[PDB]
Design a protein around this nucleic acid. Structure first.
Ligand SMILES: [K+]
Ligand SMILES: [K+]
Ligand SMILES: [K+]
Ligand SMILES: [K+]
Ligand SMILES: [K+]
Ligand SMILES: [K+]
Ligand SMILES: [Mg+2]
Ligand SMILES: [Mg+2]
Ligand SMILES: [Mg+2]
Ligand SMILES: [Mg+2]
Ligand SMILES: [Mg+2]
Ligand SMILES: [Mg+2]
Ligand SMILES: [Mg+2]
Ligand SMILES: [Mg+2]
Ligand SMILES: [Mg+2]
Ligand SMILES: [Mg+2]
Ligand SMILES: [Mg+2]
Ligand SMILES: [Mg+2]
Ligand SMILES: [Mg+2]
Ligand SMILES: [Mg+2]
Ligand SMILES: [Mg+2]
Ligand SMILES: [Mg+2]
Ligand SMILES: [Mg+2]
Ligand SMILES: [Mg+2]
Ligand SMILES: [Mg+2]
Ligand SMILES: [Mg+2]
Ligand SMILES: [Mg+2]
Ligand SMILES: [Mg+2]
Ligand SMILES: [Mg+2]
Ligand SMILES: [Mg+2]
Ligand SMILES: [Mg+2]
Ligand SMILES: [Mg+2]
Ligand SMILES: [Mg+2]
Ligand SMILES: [Mg+2]
Lengths: 44, 48, 163, 177, 48, 46
RNA sequence: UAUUCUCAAACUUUAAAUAGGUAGGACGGCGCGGCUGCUUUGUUGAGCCGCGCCACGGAAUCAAGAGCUCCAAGUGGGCCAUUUUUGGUAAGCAGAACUGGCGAUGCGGGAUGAACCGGAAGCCGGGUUACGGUGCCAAACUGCGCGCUAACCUAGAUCCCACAAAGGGUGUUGGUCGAUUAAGACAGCAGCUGCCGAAUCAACUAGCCCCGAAAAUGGAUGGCGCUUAAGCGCGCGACCUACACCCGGCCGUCGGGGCAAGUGCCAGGCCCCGAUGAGUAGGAGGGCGCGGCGGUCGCUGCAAAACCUUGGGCGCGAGCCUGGGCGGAGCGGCCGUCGGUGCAGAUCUUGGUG
């Protein structure tokens, strides 16, 4: 109600964001589908 | 644990509020049997 | 008797192993048997004397007598609602010393010393074994991740080596 | 907010052994109704594709993947393998949805309708966000129009809630497009 | 004392998972030590 | 003619009963030469 | 000689899954002595005995406990189902293997059904479910969503289950491979070719639908009906529904505990605590009722027995107590003891009556 206004260092916060962002990239990473040579056209 | 757990009489739970999905199929198949890991807690709320 | 001979249905059980026929190695005759030892009954097809009935083949029993050429063996046999202690004599060619209790004697000594060492320091402990329990938490260093996906179906591959 | 199907990344490996103290780490992107069922299907593929059963395997990480922009519309292509009553087949399907979770839900519903294929008879090979110009199905192309315009040919007549439901009414519904 | 221990364990697990994330590795949670088992089928037609 | 149906169920009503095991077992059927000497050994035991 | 197609209940190098046996201490171990006619070249062994010392119970889980004996009933026609499996074209056929089920068992669902699904049960109140359901019959949505189907064959409509095939469709909906096309394809038009100005052709695949598809009383998704399904496939929310589960009451059974210088009791009693309830054949316990006998306590011409009653009450029940009536001379309670002691059946017996 009073609109009263950190526990991590500024440098540490940047590292945390980068690590989580990098981890998310691996989560959504897809296979290259190169081992399926007979279905290259179908798989696009 | 052995003495403490054996000291407890087996819990007489009630029929689940909201019912079960399918007791004849495994929880993995969409049923109710087997290991449901942390989702046993959700069932414990409805049966306690 | 009554529709079945003594050795009926023993075509495979009493036959020798492949390329293991002929002379019996003499380590069989150098074994020492004592009262109370455990032995596994394994019928040797070449020795036709003192051979146990097919039921006792593949059973473990306890030695209760020793003769010149045979050992008396106690074998449990389930008849309806009871277990019978069947005492049979078997020539030593058909018996092998069993290793079912090999861990007992060595385990007792280890338990005795552990309790003795703990007694001197006044720390009550338990020497009981325990089954495999849950593993503790740990960290695994990151490495290259190999992606696994379902394989597109191909009819030509539905046969060993393909069509 | 709520999805029937959730996307997970499951990471696992074979138990370390003396011959291999650092066995290969495998990852999959699996669709399931919750985490427990996602793990079960992860070991199914590892057992049949990498010969690593759960009894001799190790679960490392499981994380759910959420749509980045759930407010925009994307075209989703799904490559799948399914079993019919007489064999196995491959097919490619396209859908339009705000999240890939909705598109996957549509795929399962369509496969059930047009092919009588139950959920457990489908394996998802690949998913992707297809740009409008690279779409192949005409059911998706026809909505790639800046001047999209059409009327509501079929309407559902009903009160806003059952509170205003009456068996009898003095006049028939008045409907016009 | 028990109440404090429960909160510490919950925060300890969160810290370890974040620590593994920062280093780019994985943290395998300790395997569950306790199970709760509920019988969902009746006593009719029981195999021995 | 014949069937084993229900026979295992009957056996397990009161079984399976294991025979009572005593510290000392009967010596009947053991080597008489060994038994006879053992009797003499106990006779002169002191 | 080196290869190759295809095989075996009574072939096999190899070889599972499931199942089978044994072991995880106090009936253990060690040390020092002793006994022997057995055994050894040998106090060498073997087994046993005495003394001393050590032994945190020597994997998990459970243990409404474990052992032993006596007497005896009934039964010794089975049947059904998943799976394995023999004979047989096959059978609601015949015969085996493991388990469960029915028989001996109701209850909810499957329209209906000994065996399928759920689930087993003292007498009740409340709550919640299982299987199965929520258009009417009929308790609960004509609920919130996507698609498919159009049946001029009675479209279709839920494990067991009450059927349908090979083969076909330019019916319709998806998908896969290939070919052709703004350098002008395809159809038509025009004299390989011009007009033509946008998609086209072929095969395969599988959803629903349709053909294939003929029977006798009139008839069966259970019936009516249903097509912005009340059909089919897949979802979501809520809701309905067992004698199942949970809480509470009461009855029985089983187990446990309390009650004496007794203000002290049908102690064969009272009080408290926990669990629990299916039953044919069969067994047993505690009780009800009939008629005598040995005792004891009573009733009756101021009305006994029997019988009648739309009188009333007690007990889970066998039964019991009582009002009124009829009747006109015997009868009952209690303890013990005894027996020609309890009827719906026997094509039961006699008598009577439809
Ligand atoms: K034969
Ligand atoms: K008999
Ligand atoms: K078709
Ligand atoms: K009297
Ligand atoms: K009366
Ligand atoms: K009497
Ligand atoms: Mg209970
Ligand atoms: Mg409710
Ligand atoms: Mg249900
Ligand atoms: Mg079942
Ligand atoms: Mg004979
Ligand atoms: Mg026989
Ligand atoms: Mg059942
Ligand atoms: Mg008979
Ligand atoms: Mg017979
Ligand atoms: Mg027959
Ligand atoms: Mg009968
Ligand atoms: Mg029916
Ligand atoms: Mg009720
Ligand atoms: Mg509707
Ligand atoms: Mg066909
Ligand atoms: Mg019906
Ligand atoms: Mg109760
Ligand atoms: Mg009973
Ligand atoms: Mg009387
Ligand atoms: Mg009357
Ligand atoms: Mg009386
Ligand atoms: Mg008389
Ligand atoms: Mg009589
Ligand atoms: Mg009569
Ligand atoms: Mg009768
Ligand atoms: Mg008659
Ligand atoms: Mg007559
Ligand atoms: Mg007449």
């Amino acid at each position: 109600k009073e609109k009263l206004d950190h526990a991590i260092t500024k440098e540490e916060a940047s590292a945390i964001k980068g690590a989580s962002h990098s981890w998310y990239k691996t989560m959504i990473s897809d296979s290259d589908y190169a081992e399926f040579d007979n279905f290259t056209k179908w798989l696009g | 644990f052995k003495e403490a757990n054996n000291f407890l009489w087996p819990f007489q739970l009630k029929a689940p509020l909201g019912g079960l999905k399918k007791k004849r199929n495994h929880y993995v198949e969409g049923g109710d049997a087997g290991n449901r890991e942390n989702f046993i807690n959700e069932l414990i709320r409805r049966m306690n | 008797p009554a529709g079945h001979g003594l050795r009926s249905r023993t075509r495979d059980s009493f036959s020798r192993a492949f390329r293991k026929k002929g002379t019996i190695a003499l380590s069989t005759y150098l074994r020492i048997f004592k009262i109370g030892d455990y032995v596994d009954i394994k019928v040797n097809g070449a020795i036709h004397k003192g051979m146990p009935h097919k039921f006792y083949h593949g059973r473990t029993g306890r030695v209760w007598n020793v003769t010149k050429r045979a050992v008396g063996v106690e074998v449990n046999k389930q008849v309806r609602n009871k277990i019978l202690r069947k005492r049979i004599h078997v020539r030593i060619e058909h018996v092998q010393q069993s290793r079912c209790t090999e861990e007992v004697r060595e385990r007792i000594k280890k338990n005795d010393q552990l309790k003795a060492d703990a007694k001197a320091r006044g720390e009550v402990i338990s020497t009981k074994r325990q089954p495999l329990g849950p593993k503790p938490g740990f960290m695994v260093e990151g490495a290259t991740l190999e992606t696994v996906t379902p394989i597109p179906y191909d009819v030509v591959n539905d046969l060993k080596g393909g069509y | 907010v709520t999805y029937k199907f959730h996307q997970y990344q499951v990471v696992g490996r074979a138990l370390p052994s003396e011959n291999d103290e650092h066995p290969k780490i495998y990852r999959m992107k699996l669709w399931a109704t919750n985490e427990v069922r996602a793990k079960s299907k992860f070991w199914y593929f590892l057992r049949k594709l990498k010969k690593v059963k759960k009894s001799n395997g190790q679960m490392l990480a499981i994380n759910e993947i959420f749509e980045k922009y759930p407010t925009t519309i994307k075209n989703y292509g799904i490559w799948l393998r399914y079993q019919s009553r007489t064999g196995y087949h491959n097919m490619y399907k396209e859908y339009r949805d705000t999240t890939l979770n909705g598109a996957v839900e549509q795929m399962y519903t369509e496969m059930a309708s047009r092919h009588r294929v139950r959920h457990h008879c489908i394996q998802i090979i690949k998913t992707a966000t297809i740009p409008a110009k690279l779409c192949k199905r005409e059911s998706t192309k026809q909505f790639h129009d800046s001047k999209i315009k059409f009327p509501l040919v079929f309407k559902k007549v009903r009160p806003p809630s059952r509170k205003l439901k009456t068996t009898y009414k003095a006049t028939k519904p008045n409907l016009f497009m | 004392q028990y109440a404090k221990e429960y909160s510490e364990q919950e925060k300890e697990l969160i810290r370890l998972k974040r620590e593994a994330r920062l280093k780019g590795g994985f943290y395998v949670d300790p395997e569950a030590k306790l199970l709760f088992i509920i019988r969902i089928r009746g006593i009719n037609a029981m195999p021995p | 003619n014949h069937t084993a149906h229900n026979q295992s169920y009957k056996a397990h009503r009161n079984g399976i009963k294991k025979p009572k095991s005593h510290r000392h077992s009967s010596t009947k059927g053991m080597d008489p030469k060994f038994l006879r000497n053992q009797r003499y050994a106990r006779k002169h035991n002191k």
